[PDB]
Amino acid sequence: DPMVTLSSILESIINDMRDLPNTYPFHTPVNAKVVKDYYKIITRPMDLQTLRENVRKRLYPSREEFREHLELIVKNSATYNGPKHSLTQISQSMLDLCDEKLKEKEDKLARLEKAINPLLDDDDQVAFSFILDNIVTQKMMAVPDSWPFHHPVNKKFVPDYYKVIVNPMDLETIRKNISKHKYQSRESFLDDVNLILANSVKYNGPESQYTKTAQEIVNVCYQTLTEYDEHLTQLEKDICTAKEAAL
Numbered sequence: 705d706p707m708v709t710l711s712s713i714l715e716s717i718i719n720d721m722r723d724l725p726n727t728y729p730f731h732t733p734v735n736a737k738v739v740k741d742y743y744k745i746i747t748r749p750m751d752l753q754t755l756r757e758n759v760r761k762r763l764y765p766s767r768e769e770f771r772e773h774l775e776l777i778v779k780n781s782a783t784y785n786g787p788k789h790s791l792t793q794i795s796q797s798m799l800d801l802c803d804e805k806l807k808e809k810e811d812k813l814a815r816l817e818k819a820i821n822p823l824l825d826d827d828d829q830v831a832f833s834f835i836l837d838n839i840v841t842q843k844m845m846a847v848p849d850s851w852p853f854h855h856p857v858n859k860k861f862v863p864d865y866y867k868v869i870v871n872p873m874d875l876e877t878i879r880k881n882i883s884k885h886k887y888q889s890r891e892s893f894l895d896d897v898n899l900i901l902a903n904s905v906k907y908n909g910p911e912s913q914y915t916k917t918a919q920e921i922v923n924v925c926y927q928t929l930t931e932y933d934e935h936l937t938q939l940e941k942d943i944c945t946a947k948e949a950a951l
């Protein structure tokens with residue numbers, strides 16, 4: 705079972721990062737009853753013990769989902785402690801070691817990832833995802849003043865955001881989904897794109913400048929999809945065929 709082999713590699717990387725100097729504050733969940741404002745500032749807590757338990761629950765089918773959770777440890781430290789705090793440097797040292805190990809094992813990891821999910825090697829899936837990513841970076845992120853939608857809201861700067869928006873979305877998360885080949889057709893992609901606009905209507909109001917920007921993001925998305933409709937339709941057909949053959 706390639707999921708077992710993958711999980712054993714990921715656990716070995718956790719063992720290696722746990723062994724780096726001064727990393728203990730990241731080995732287990734923050735005690736939010738001691739660090740009393742922690743959840744008022746941090747939205748996605750993560751630590752090496754939770755990461756290991758997730759590896760064992762088979763939650764990570766690839767390098768990328770594991771690395772995204774590992775990166776939360778660094779991002780959380782940067783937000784709570786500060787970008788140059790020694791704790792953030794320590795957490796970064798674990799992410800750096802992870803990247804070294806993933807690089808060392810990249811061919812084996814690619815093979816396991818392909819055995820777990822054959823669509824990651826499907827040329828039509830790859831071409832489709834490449835087009836979506838180009839739409840996001842060259843058209844949607846090029847909308848003037850679209851910066852509020854490029855990355856997840858940091859609760860440190862907008863403290864009530866996630867009490868209002870419980871199903872958040874942003875363009876970086878969409879790009880990560882594309883990189884993970886989450887989207888097999890335009891429908892799921894447009895579900896996430898439209899969630900950005902719906903959340904702006906809810907949080908900012910229908911007449912806010914934020915919402916006008918989100919509307920323009922959605923509109924240039926539709927326009928660019930229409931320009932590539934015939935290629936995208938063929939790719940979606942061939943992806944569906946690959947998905948059915950994987951049965």
Ligand SMILES: C=CCCn1cc(-c2cc(C3([S@](C)(=N)=O)CC3)nc(-c3ccnc4[nH]ccc34)n2)c2cc[nH]c2c1=O
Binds near residue numbers: 851857904908
């Ligand atoms: C992705 C969809 C969310 C859309 N969005 C996003 C924001 C937003 C985002 C960001 C980030 S950050 C730096 N990573 O937090 C880059 C994302 N910074 C700030 C910010 C940070 C400090 N002071 C501020 N003064 C006014 C805004 C502001 N604001 C927002 C603020 C009010 N409404 C909305 C809204 O609807």
